[model samples]
Target: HMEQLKCCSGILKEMFAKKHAAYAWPFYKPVDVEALGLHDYCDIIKHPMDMSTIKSKLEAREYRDAQEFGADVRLMFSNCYKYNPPDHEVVAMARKLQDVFEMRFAKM
Candidate 1:
């Protein structure tokens, strides 16, 4: 099962790269609480997540399955919605990438 998960994840990895390049290409890195001066960032967004963090998990095989990875991916988007008051391109990109993730994840 683990091997299958890892092998099939090539599709996921490609999805991530393509959509991320289309989205994150024009944007930033993992959510920066301090640099962005978000005082209550940690207080509000309980579990912050981003591509960099997800990459580490993927590289380490920390995710038990694609569902787990999908969970975290959605968590990252949810965190965006929870933080941005539902505006800005940040939120926009997150949602698009989320849709991208969900559409592909189902096949996995």
Candidate 2:
């Protein structure tokens, strides 16, 4: 599901791009600070996830679990949705995947 989501869309990469000046989420230490467009927000950061690698793996359908994948998508939605246009399918899929992952995470 995440593989389809990533291969079908590039919004997550744009969210991580450094050129976007609209909204900035916190940085995740040990993660790619530059890739996520992070620049020291009160010395705090969002969840540390290697979106670049994840995207690559997701494209290949090599990543099965949607734990961090859902996290990445949810973070993007939380911080960047206002500046982004509404896409019914993307948003709906993202929500569905995130919900599934949430239940899985809680169960584990």
Candidate 3:
């Protein structure tokens, strides 16, 4: 059923809050690609995702459900994978956050 996909499922709020507190470093806010002078970034990443952005949507009840939220989270990490080195600190930390997200997200 799409019940799992509803934004008001109530589980999503808890999930979002948990992730907000669970991780730090490079995920909380929008990337300053222009300010950092990474001019090519905007050209490559069509759908940029970030932790704080998710919060805004979550608060707005904009997501269809957990799948939409997860997709955005996955997109954030996927962007990192495309733009950052596999062994770089940013990618390494991203891997950790991704693991935790999927782990808990699989549960009831």
Candidate 4:
């Protein structure tokens, strides 16, 4: 079940990578910072902020972005609600997967 959620989120991210801005949730979630009009937003936040500040903002952005992408992925995986959204327990499971999946960034 949790794996399904993570899989859904991953799929959503993939789908999101293909689209441009202005697409709303479920159908489209923001991917490209430029497409989402967040590139400049990140830049300003990055330049003026300290590491802790930037890290906090990054975490916030990540969670919000994940939710947007996750919803679309959940929709597709569930066959348009044939299955249903991930429940509260599923969120933690998916979150772990997200964390593990993102750990590669630390190696870079």
Candidate 5:
């Protein structure tokens, strides 16, 4: 449970910035760049450009992180399953969604 919880906590922290971007991309339409005091040459405009490139980069990062997360969960279960069988419940919850997660991750 410790490792599982720890891994989730780390993932949540790491995804904070990404969550902001992900939310903003669809919700925050900056129609009036001047109102936001933005410029023609700015990161605000520069970022999320080149849709294919951004898509690839973000997908790769997400896939790598998910792989690490799965490995961590597997390691925890492998090393301590017998001694701490009770923790399998937590591991199970994590694993249950992994199939769907991997399916989508692979497409990305």
Candidate 6:
């Protein structure tokens, strides 16, 4: 089951990359990132991106008028075609997460 999960994660990442150019070419790492599904079972291998800056943007509504930025993050689990779904929602959320920081923080 663990091996299958790891493989699934990798395939999922690739699926997203092909769709979004901004995403990492190969999202998942080359290791078994699945755990025993424990509460503290951190995915040491699948490191999600940091979206601290996005919080600020959301608070100030800086990029409120931007289409590039949407609801803080995308559905990580939905980083696929019609019938596919990513295993980890949080991990998927992190991957799909992004902000219009450049546009909001751009120097004028």
Question: Which lDDT values do the candidates have, in the order given?
Answer: 0.71, 0.45, 0.72, 0.36, 0.37, 0.33
Q: Which stretches of candidate 6 lie over 4 Å from their true place?
A: 1-52, 64-66, 75-85, 88-108
- Compared with the true structure, what per-residue lDDT tens digits does model 1 show for residues 1-108? 686467436645764575477775422357767765588889998888876677778788888876787787778878888887677777887777767667767665
lDDT of candidate 3 at residue 106, scale 0 to 100 = 80
TM-score of 3: 0.75
Query: Whole-model lDDT for model 4 versus the true structure?
Result: 0.36
Best by lDDT: 3
Give the Å error, residue 57, model 5.
Answer: 14
Residue 102 of model 2 has an lDDT of 51
Per-residue error for 64 in candidate 1, Å, reads 1.4
What tens-digit string does per-residue lDDT give for candidate 2 at 19-75? 532232222113344645346522553443434545665677664565545565456
The residue ranges of model 1 lying beyond 4 angstroms of the native Cα positions read 15-22, 25-28
Worst 10 residues of 2 by lDDT: 21-30
Per-model TM-score versus the true fold: 0.77, 0.30, 0.75, 0.21, 0.24, 0.21
- Give lDDT tens digits, candidate 4, residues 2-86: 4443553454343334331122222332223465544563443322212233234334554344444344333333332222246
Give the alpha carbon lDDT tens digit for every residue of 1-108 in model 5: 444434544533332335334332221222234544335424423332222332343445533444554454343333323322455553353344333334444543
- Of the candidates numbered 3 and 4, which has the greater lDDT value? 3
Backbone steric clashes in candidate 2, count: 1
**TM-score preference between candidates 3 and 6, better one:** 3
Best by TM-score: 1
In model 1, which range of ten residues has the least summed lDDT?
A: 19-28
Residue 37 lDDT, candidate 1, scale 0-100: 57
Looking at model 3, which ten-residue stretch has the lowest summed lDDT?
A: 6-15
Task: Score candidate 6 by lDDT.
Answer: 0.33
- Candidate 3 Cα errors over 4 Å, as ranges: 1-23, 35-37
